[PDB]
């Protein structure tokens, strides 16, 4: 466990081998969860890329935050996809917090602290705990099979995961860089493995 | 009577059966009244929907706040409609307070605290007290007969009704979330009934 | 004399009979004067209308503040007209103070506190005191002969008249709602007569 | 010498005879100098006009600040002209301070306190002291020969001249209306002669 | 060594001979370095020009910050070029800090304090110390061979160089005009040689 406060991973070269593998001390299936992270890249106006790949033995797209060109952020759970349209994109670091609950099928998507409309997805599903979490690549098969046109070039950090739905105030605090205690994946006590061209540098975002 | 402070109803699925029925302890015909409520949805640029349906035995459109695509907010009382044009629409929660008086036929429409021009409507009319108040659907017949293309997808709350015209200062306080005492329908001591896919969640708006 | 502080006249229906007649305790011809008033209407983008009609036995257009569509505010004294172009119009209440002096022919036009370029008009003229001041209509004949397409729909108040040119600081105070003492027509001690569909309500502007 | 603090000259009518003649207590040729003044007019989008005409027996355009339509401010010394492009023009009073030095040929042009790029002009020249300074007209011959299409309609004041290059801080103070001591032409102790339709009024700019 | 605080070099005439030659007390090859400087010119929308030319016996483009029209800032090291696109350009002084590291090949480009995405360039290279640093010209051969269409017209100063990568906080301080200690090239104790039409003046930027 190492403190990545004020640090981020760098993926400077578009490639199909540079990636960082994350290990979650997970033991129970998730009925709900939220994920927050900073990322910064200029590919938005160019081609699609993968923000966060959570994969399991049954599905290569167990959880996938994906940008599709001219469309926006594409959130998918259990192999279904909603879209959250972004008409115009700005060139700057962006913070995003997304949360899903099994009971209602509600999905909350927060971009830059402003909440998007709630929607429905895969009501009654169960997300398995046997996970491979990968960053900088979209994983179409368990622990491998990446795509260069889906690999992400840029800077990312502060990745934190919970297993229950936070309240709006809480999201505001996360945005506010306040104290908080993630209980599934800790940026503050994180465990990781690096592969290929990846590097550790101070974060650009404040 | 339950306190819905900081809470709203959620209609996530476009459907013709999810709706919430509200009971007003009303005993006198309204010579005037104001209604305030928060709502948030992205259908504005897509298709028409119903904000607030007040219906009685004589008219399915006794009071109707309705968005008509490319037009704006459409207010109707006793079966007549004015229009309040909105040239461009923004994607964010919006607050609206509307008031009508029997004596003059004046209608005041407040959107985001900025008052629209006063207009005329149905001077000398009487609104009956035998009411069915429905939310999330447009009711074309007493207690039923909804339309999927008119059902509203999104988040709403803080619905409050008076029976006399408030002053502009008062509207400002309402916007300001100050203390106030509604005497027909209380969000603070509200009575309700829920049907179909509807849920209670914390509000997104501040 | 009644105090109209925080009050305005309402003309909700486009008509040729609703109007309010104002009586000035005037006894000397005006060599100069300023007029200030608030008005609010959405007809700006639709058709022309009359802001303030000052008429006498010799001229139906002794003083006329008139909006001409696609052109802007049209100020006329003694039967001649300048134009003050407004390229684009916003939908909100607008304050306007205009002043004319017989000695120089200078006309000062203030809109929302920002001064327009000074211009020339009818140098050496005399405005008569035998006046009929009318609001909400353009008067083409002494005390009558209105035009529906020139009648004004909306809300107006704070109408005040002096008989000498105020300084820019003074205009700023007027805009600032400071204390002031009009000596020809007092909103604070005003005298009036109402005809047709006209009503008294609290002002919308702050 | 009269104090024109808070006062400006008015040229309301486009004409070829209204002008104001200024007398400088000048006795030495200028190796450098700066000139500052306020002016306000709406002709910018219509036709060209003259801001400041400094003329001598040898050249009708010894110094000329001239607006050329669709181009911008045109500064000329000793019969040569640079251009300072203005893409779009706003309708408001504008302050301008310009300075030239004989040693380097550098010209500094300040508009609304923001400095334009330095440029070169007429290096090694000498400006003569036998001057006729004219305002509101472009003078193509010593003390006469004006052009209606070059005469300026509007309001101007605060005209001050030095004979050495001020520093940027100094310009900032001038903009800031701070205390300062001009040594060639004083608005504070100015000497003038008026001809035709010209008048003295309080300034509109703050 | 002379203090150029609050001073800049001026290149007013487009020419192929006016230039300023800078001598670095350098004795070791650079494994990394950052360079910061202010510059101001209006050629951005007209033609390409050279910001900073660092040249050695082996390469005329050892380091080159170059603006290419319709493209933006073009950074090149060891004869390779990345591009940092600028969609639209504003007319004002601009501050730029750029840094490169031999270990990773990372390049950081800061414009107006806002960081551009990190990229890759020439990993494992070595920059030689036998340098000719030239300003206002692009040098295609050791100590000569300039191009008029590449010469830069305008005002520049505050040029400072380090030999290791500063942190983001540090860049912020540089932008903030805070105290700092450059160890390769000091604006505060700078050594220089001037040739042709170049002059020393107070800086325009704050």
Swiss-Prot record, chains A, B, C, D, E:
SUPFAM superfamilies: Concanavalin A-like lectins/glucanases. Residues 5-206 form the Pentraxin (PTX) domain. Its cofactor is Ca(2+). Binds 2 calcium ions per subunit. Ca(2+) 2 binds at residues 138, 140, 150. It is found in: Secreted. Ca(2+) 1 binds at residues 60-61, 138-140. Induction: The concentration of CRP in plasma increases greatly during acute phase response to tissue injury, infection or other inflammatory stimuli. It is induced by IL1/interleukin-1 and IL6/interleukin-6. Disulfide bonds join 36-97. GO terms for molecular function: calcium ion binding; choline binding; complement component C1q complex binding; identical protein binding; low-density lipoprotein particle binding; low-density lipoprotein particle receptor binding. Keywords: Acute phase, Calcium, Disulfide bond, Metal-binding, Pyrrolidone carboxylic acid, Secreted, Signal. One of its GO terms (cellular component) is extracellular space. It holds the Pfam family Pentaxin. Its main location: secreted. The modification Pyrrolidone carboxylic acid is found at residue 1. Found in plasma. One of its GO terms (biological process) is acute-phase response. PANTHER family: C-REACTIVE PROTEIN (PTHR45869:SF7), C-REACTIVE PROTEIN-RELATED (PTHR45869). Displays several functions associated with host defense: it promotes agglutination, bacterial capsular swelling, phagocytosis and complement fixation through its calcium-dependent binding to phosphorylcholine. Can interact with DNA and histones and may scavenge nuclear material released from damaged circulating cells. Homopentamer. Pentraxin (or pentaxin) have a discoid arrangement of 5 non-covalently bound subunits. Interacts with FCN1; may regulate monocyte activation by FCN1. This protein owes its name to its ability precipitate pneumococcal C-polysaccharide in the presence of calcium. Belongs to the pentraxin family. This is C-reactive protein. It comes from Homo sapiens (Human). The lineage of its organism: Eukaryota, Metazoa, Chordata, Craniata, Vertebrata. The gene is CRP.
């Amino acid at each position: 466990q190492t403190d990545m406060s004020r640090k981020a991973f760098v993926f400077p070269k578009e490639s199909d081998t540079s990636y960082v593998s994350l290990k979650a001390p997970l033991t129970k299936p998730l009925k709900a969860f939220t994920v927050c992270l900073h990322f910064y890249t200029e590919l938005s106006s160019t081609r699609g890329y993968s923000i966060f790949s959570y994969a399991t033995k049954r599905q290569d797209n167990e959880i996938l935050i994906f940008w599709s060109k001219d469309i926006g952020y594409s959130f998918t759970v259990g192999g279904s996809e909603i879209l959250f349209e972004v008409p115009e994109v700005t060139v700057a670091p962006v913070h995003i917090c997304t949360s899903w609950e099994s009971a209602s099928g509600i999905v909350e998507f927060w971009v830059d602290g402003k909440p998007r409309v709630r929607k429905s997805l895969k009501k009654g599903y169960t997300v398995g705990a046997e996970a491979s979490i990968i960053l900088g690549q979209e994983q179409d098969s368990f622990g491998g099979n990446f795509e260069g046109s889906q690999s992400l070039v840029g800077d990312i950090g502060n990745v934190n995961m919970w297993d229950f739905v936070l309240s709006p105030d809480e999201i505001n605090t996360i945005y506010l860089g306040g104290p908080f205690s993630p209980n599934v994946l800790n940026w503050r006590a994180l465990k990781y493995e690096v592969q290929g061209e990846v590097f550790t540098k101070p974060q650009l975002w404040p």
